[model samples]
Target: MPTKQQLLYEGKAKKIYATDEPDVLWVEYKDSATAFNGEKKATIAGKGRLNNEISSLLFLKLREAGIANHFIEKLSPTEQLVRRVTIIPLEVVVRNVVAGSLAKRIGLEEGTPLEAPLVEFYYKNDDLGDPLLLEDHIFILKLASREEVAALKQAALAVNDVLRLHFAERNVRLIDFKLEFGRTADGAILLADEISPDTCRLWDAKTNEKLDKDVFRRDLGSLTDAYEVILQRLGGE
Candidate 1:
């Protein structure tokens, strides 16, 4: 049994605390951030608040698209209430265009569009830098059954469809993003975790400006300014 008042767990970005409701939990975004498996670190003053708002808006938009998820409600500027689950320990990544690793993987130029969307699965092992896994590797490791794998891919694509149109309307390109799912007590998989700039790579459609964590990763410019632009474009929903 977990304590009702104390923190249940802390990750690279969020802290989880058990709630009075057995199936519910509270999450607080943190300023501490890392990249390259902790090789790069920073403490941005307003990062937590920005991610909370951005994630809350995206989750709500996704639900409007009839996508089921674990997001419950936002409690404060940097806090949210969510469902608790046993996470699947997999990172389901969807790419709309060549950027990041996919570009490096194929010697393709960044910003090149793919003929079709690509879906990838990676083991959620920080020590291993979340190495990519094939269908067989996933099955060999018994991480997920075929049906579960299918569900993950389908959900990822659906999310992509929802986000792509939304961001495009705001003149932002959704290069790629990561997703994590979890098994609910009822034995159903629901999208979990925060969906914010930290988990996504968004570029300005025209200027090709980085409007996400890449600003911090590359020391390009103001990280807060990019997030603020996104928030304003989304009408701060």
Candidate 2:
């Protein structure tokens, strides 16, 4: 069996490792949790496994919808196999409702339904606080070309549609979520990064109870317990 060789990159919530195949990678979900650009942090036991399973299942569903992503298959409760790609230094956020930074920025109350989905881009640089980027700023920074930005926007919206409906059926509301995209060897962009609670804002449809990382971010409750509710609701093992 192919095995992971060495650590390639370590991010806030996951670690990447080189695999036997040059284009393949082994991803280990980390137990570390952080918010507010890594200002808030914790190492909650079992968090990694929860994110691994949730992200794996969600990626599988996206794949079934013909959405392309890096996920290959789950290797273990806290590990997965993926195709390696050069990640674009951007966080594509698709929002269906006013929440989180959006609310804070616009001075709107949380949970307000937006007339249409809003797509925002943020630089993925942690030191710069991942500042929101305007289209002009993106070009000035040479982060992505106009065509590439358009592609990212279209892909993110498509994903939002699929995930919004996916969560709705499970009696959860997908308030907003962040997505990362990467360029494959041939320069094709595919969805990259995880899609667990860490990268999403999931709310119980009826009660509006947070089922995502906001539990940890806001000190609302046990991080693992909140994640477990999501895993159980997602029918994950």
Candidate 3:
């Protein structure tokens, strides 16, 4: 049995804690949901458990798809035990369709299908406002080595492929998603971020209903129902 310590970090949906097992890190899910830069919010009890389970399932799927990620295994109903990696200070966003802030930012209409989904990189500076970045900017700023950037791009495409297919199997369309990568002690880079409604945009295939954060952001109702519908669609497979 691993003993849990005080939480190390709290993100939008999950909390990280030190574990008794030196090789493992523990993550706890939170029921809180936020939108519009967290200005809008709501609490759907048990959302944490749903997300934790869904993320764990998705991570396992990614691994099976031959992608290297930091997920180890599920520790509890709402907890996951994972490998702790040195996270890079960037958010890698891959979009399959135009929607949300991305659409508004580029003045593109919602639901525009991109020929090849654009990959956008953002500096992970919470204080400086998480500014969007370009590949050349990253090289000039010395944020990561050329090899590292290349690796990141490869990993992003791998993730997008796996996740898009996964959602499609459940009659959900994955519009856009964000991912973070980290370096292992052995210098191997792996995907290292939470993949849940908080990070990805999902829409129902039949109804075109938004199944992600946009519900809360746009005052759409049944946020929890949407999440549960997705989980139910997953059907514990």
Candidate 4:
């Protein structure tokens, strides 16, 4: 039994704590929610637990698909055990269809099918609104080495491929999603961060009804039903 120690770091939706095992960490999910980078906020009941389940299931699925990740085990309904790593200051967004900021950025309406997946990178700085970064920009900013950037792109695309098919099997359209990666002590880069309704823009396949965080962001309706529907469709406990 690993004993959790003092606090490490607190993020918007999760908290990290040290543990007796130096190479391992405990992650606790929080029900607290926010949009627009903390500009809009609300505390959704059961949000943390649902997200934990969703992320764990998805990470397990991805790992079985041959993608390496940082997830170790589920510690609780809203917490998990994971390996410690140095996170890259980059957020990778993979788009399979035109929606959200992509649609708004271009003149395309939501749900426009993209011929191929589009990979976008963003600086992971909250103070600057997580501004977008191009490949050259990433190189100039020293966010990731050229090799690391290439690896990140390859990994993100692989994740998009596997998750897109799985979501389709569950009748959920994986429009787009964000991914973060970290370097383990051995120098291997693995996928990190949570994958849930809060991270992906899920929609009903037949009708494109939003089933992800958009429900909270756009005031579509209660996120509980949306997330629960997802949890069950994905065979959650």
Candidate 5:
């Protein structure tokens, strides 16, 4: 049996718990779903386990690539035990194609492939409105040191490279994704939070069909099936 701890915070799709060690935490996946900044939502049973599995796989892959991350191991099908790192109040987004919010914001047609994927930064504030940010803005805001920002950019790119190929091998296109990072007590910046369709845009490996949250956002169809395709393609190991 897995050890239990005091509940920390429960978000839309995750429940965090405080562990015995101050620098460790446990995350339990939930079936709740949200879109448009938590404006729309539905709970799909089993969605949490699916995301937990997917995120755990990706985190292991990243760690193998020498990227630091918070994931320690899967405690259950729907739970992960991870280190409790000091989360950076920023969101690092990488886009391989112009779509979704970025497309709408820039007036570009959806599915427009960029010459190169762009790495964008955003302040992780839901109330203040998560605004698009520039390097200078981050440096000036003092949210992170210039060195930390530089490291974040490099880390984002590294994630893109690794995840893009990882998905490509499964015949999926890593359209774009958001990542969060945190600092360990030892001052190590590591990728934090789960990486799943909830936090990324995954398209059909072959048909380029929109998977991930796009279905919910556009009311397309079968969000569960889309997520299943990704899991199956990854061999569900």
Candidate 6:
């Protein structure tokens, strides 16, 4: 049993801490909400607990589906234990519908669906504004090897397949989501970020009503209420 120790890192909505077990980390999800690359921010009561529970449930499902990830266990409503890894400087996004930047980028309608899932990558450097990158840019920047890139794509797609169906089964559509990966001590890449309404673009399957962070980002409704609906639908509560 690893005991939580010193603080390791703190992000917009989570805090990381060292543990007695060197390979493990203690994560504390926060009540804060951030969007538009941090230009918009606020603290929603219970947001931390909601995200922690929802993310834990989703990770548990993915594990049962044989996905390798950093999650170890849920420690509390707002805390979890995860394997520590050096997070790769990339955000892997998989999209099934045209929305957000994608809709604006191509002048397509937000609800447009694609025949196939689209996998995209963005550099994680905040200073450079997290620019989208090409495969050649990834190679020249030496962020990840060609083999690793392929592996990432395959792994991401597998996750999308699992989660898309999982959400659909619960009356929600998984329109798209963001993911982060990390390298373990053994040099294996594992999924390393929270999977929740915060990172996923979810919709009510029948009504097409937004049920994810857009409620917070676009001021559509109570963030907590939206997340509550997600957790309830996922059977997380």
lDDT of 3 by residue, 1-237 (tens): 677876889887789998987667899998998776667777878788888888888899898999888899888878988888988899999999999888899898999999996888999877777889988888888888889998888889889988898899889999999999988788888888788877889999989999987877887887777778777777752
Candidate 3: residue pairs that collide: none
Residues 1-237 of candidate 6 have per-residue lDDT tens digits of: 778899988999999999999899999999999988899999899999999999999999999999999999999899999989999899999999989888988999898979999999999998898898987899999999999999999999999999999999999999999999999878899999899999999999999889989999899989999899999998865
lDDT of 3 at 197: 79
lDDT sort, best first: 6, 2, 4, 1, 5, 3
RMSD of 5: 1.4
Model 5 lDDT tens row, 85-150: 888999999999998889999999978988987999999998877899988898788899989988
| Model 2 weakest 10-residue run by lDDT | 228-237
Clash count, predicted structure 4: 0
Measured against the true structure, the TM-scores of the candidates, in listed sequence, are 0.96, 0.98, 0.94, 0.98, 0.96, 0.98
Q: Model 1, residue 178: what's the lDDT? A: 96
Which ranges of candidate 6 are over 4 A from the true structure? Answer: none
lDDT of 4 at 31: 92
Q: Which regions of candidate 4 fall more than 4 Å away from where they truly are?
A: none
What's the lDDT for residue 82 in model 4? 87
Cα lDDT for residue 70, candidate 5: 86
Per-candidate local distance difference test: 0.90, 0.93, 0.85, 0.92, 0.88, 0.93
- lDDT for 105 in candidate 5 is 96
Give the 10-residue window scoring lowest on summed lDDT in candidate 6. 228-237
Worst 10 residues of 5 by lDDT: 1-10
